[PDB]
Amino acid sequence: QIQLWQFLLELLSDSANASCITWEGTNGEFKMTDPDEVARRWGERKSKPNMNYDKLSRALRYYYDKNIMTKVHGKRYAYKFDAHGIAQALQPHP
Amino acid sequence: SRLANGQIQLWQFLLELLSDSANASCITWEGTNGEFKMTDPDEVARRWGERKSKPNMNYDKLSRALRYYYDKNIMTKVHGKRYAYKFDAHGIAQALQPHP
Amino acid sequence: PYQILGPTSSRLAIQLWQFLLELLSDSANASCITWEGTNGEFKMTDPDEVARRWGERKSKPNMNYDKLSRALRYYYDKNIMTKVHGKRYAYKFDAHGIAQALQPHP
DNA sequence: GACCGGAAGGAAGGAAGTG
DNA sequence: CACTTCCTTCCTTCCGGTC
Numbered sequence: 001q002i003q004l005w006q007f008l009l010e011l012l013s014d015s016a017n018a019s020c021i022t023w024e025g026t027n028g029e030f031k032m033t034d035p036d037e038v039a040r041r042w043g044e045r046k047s048k049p050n051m052n053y054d055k056l057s058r059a060l061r062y063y064y065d066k067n068i069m070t071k072v073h074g075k076r077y078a079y080k081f082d083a084h085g086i087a088q089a090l091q092p093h094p
Numbered sequence: 095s096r097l098a099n100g101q102i103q104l105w106q107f108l109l110e111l112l113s114d115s116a117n118a119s120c121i122t123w124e125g126t127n128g129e130f131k132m133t134d135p136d137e138v139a140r141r142w143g144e145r146k147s148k149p150n151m152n153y154d155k156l157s158r159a160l161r162y163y164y165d166k167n168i169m170t171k172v173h174g175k176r177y178a179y180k181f182d183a184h185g186i187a188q189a190l191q192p193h194p
Numbered sequence: 195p196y197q198i199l200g201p202t203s204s205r206l207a208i209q210l211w212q213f214l215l216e217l218l219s220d221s222a223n224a225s226c227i228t229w230e231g232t233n234g235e236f237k238m239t240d241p242d243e244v245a246r247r248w249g250e251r252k253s254k255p256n257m258n259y260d261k262l263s264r265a266l267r268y269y270y271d272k273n274i275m276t277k278v279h280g281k282r283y284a285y286k287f288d289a290h291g292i293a294q295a296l297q298p299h300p
Numbered sequence: 301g302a303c304c305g306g307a308a309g310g311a312a313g314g315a316a317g318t319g
Numbered sequence: 320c321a322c323t324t325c326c327t328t329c330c331t332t333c334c335g336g337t338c
Contacts, residue, residue, distance in 0.1 A: 001312075003329070035302095047280040051331075053302090059330060061305070065152045066329095076302070092149045100316070103325070148327075153306095155327055161308065162326075165242070165258040176306070192255045209321070254323075260310095265322055267312065272321095282310070 004059045005068055007042055024078070032077035095186065104159045105168045105186065107145055111138070124172075128181030135177050195232035201292050210265050211274050211287070213248055230278070234287040241283045259283075 002010075011017040012030055020037035023030050032038050035053040043051035060079055063069045067085035072078030095109055102110075111117045112130055120137035123130050132138050135153045143151030160179055163169045167185035172178035202215035217223045218236060226243035229236050238244045241259040249257025266285055269275040273291035278284035293299075 055331060062154055065154060066150070089150065094144065094149060159326060162260060165260070166256065189256065194253060194255050261323060
């Protein structure tokens with residue numbers, strides 16, 4: 001199915017959807033400017049009327065452990081994709 | 095369990111680590127009746143990955159596996175303690191020699 | 195409803211979809227399973243009861259919902275039934291799938 | 301309110317065993 | 320085959336907590 005981490009890159013790529021989500025430079029760093037709006041779409045996308053930011057953020061926090069993306073400290077609605085994290089998952093040395 | 099004799103099952107693999115106290119770092123017992131605790135859930139998960147050739151394995155995915163054992167009655171959650179699961183002898187007994 | 199009881203009772207004259215419609219026949223089993231719309235949509239109101247029974251009729255214990263559900267998950271591509279999106283324990287039969295299985299018309 | 305992480309359980313679909 | 324078995328993967332859907 002459509003994975004969340006993918007569905008975010010679906011909207012980040014389109015600069016017309018800068019109202020809800022957009023990049024913030026650094027290195028693969030991004031922000032949700034309208035947190036509710038993001039969750040609202042990811043809701044309808046998966047036939048989910050209840051899906052809010054809390055339920056979405058939970059989904060994102062699992063990626064801290066999967067080592068896909070990390071939370072940008074202090075900065076509100078700030079999540080940064082982890083290159084090394086993703087690189088250590090497709091070039092592993094057990 | 096030594097009475098085992100497909101691949102290793104999680105409930106089995108855990109009893110392998112529990113038997114040896116060299117692995118007391120990440121997993122260990124907590125009183126009688128098979129109450130056990132994971133003292134480093136991260137470590138346990140990583141080995142269950144090593145054993146099943148699956149480097150991605152993390153608690154969320156491992157833990158989900160344990161939670162399927164509630165209907166098999168193979169092991170149970172200790173509600174009080176964090177990262178603490180209790181085995182069920184009768185469960186693994188019925189799992190090995192089922193009687194209709 | 196009555197229309198769907200055509201296929202079910204004609205095959206009754208043992209696969210899992212057959213057994214599910216054997217449960218939907220009459221009622222008193224409404225406690226565990228029943229219909230939504232008579233299009234095909236149906237819900238399991240006690241999933242773990244449906245399971246317990248299905249295991250009993252096949253003479254195999256340790257038959258939970260996950261093991262039953264996985265069986266329904268293979269019916270997706272055979273086109274015997276489909277999932278109802280965002281409805282806990284809700285599935286929908288495909289008449290055109292049951293058609294091919296009862297009568298082969300290539 | 302944003303943020304953290306258990307914990308439960310759904311739902312999908314691989315992979316190997318059943319008989 | 321038509322499942323059964325055992326997951327792995329990916330989340331919703333609650334929480335009781337920190338800040």
